[PDB]
């Protein structure tokens, strides 16, 4: 849950860092990708729960 939230606002902070160009679109797909990873961690870990 904290990884989904921090990956979400961190995803939006990568949208900030890409809107200013300090980070490329690669990090956008890393916080995006890692965000969906944490989505399957939480929801799939509800299944494993």
């Amino acid at each position: 849950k904290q990884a989904v939230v921090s990956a979400q606002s961190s995803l939006d902070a990568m949208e900030a860092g890409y809107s200013v160009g300090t980070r490329t679109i690669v990090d956008v797909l890393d916080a995006t990708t890692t965000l969906y990873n944490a989505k399957q961690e939480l929801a799939n870990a509800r299944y494993n729960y």
């Binding site: 902070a13 900030a16 860092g17 809107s19 200013v20």
Partner: protein, 49 residues
């Protein structure tokens, strides 16, 4: 005096150009302060401009 006259008009247009650039950096470094977008630093750089 015509040459220095219209030359002064031309450098006047140059000051309008650079002042336009500095004004647009003030505006679009001004509408996003206090955030991850733009800080006080490059804002005051645009104000020095």
């Amino acid at each position: 005096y015509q040459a220095t006259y219209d030359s002064a008009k031309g450098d006047l247009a140059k000051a309008q150009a650079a002042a336009n650039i500095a004004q647009l950096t003030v505006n679009r470094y001004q509408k996003l302060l206090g955030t991850q977008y733009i800080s006080k630093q490059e804002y005051d750089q645009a104000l020095a401009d």
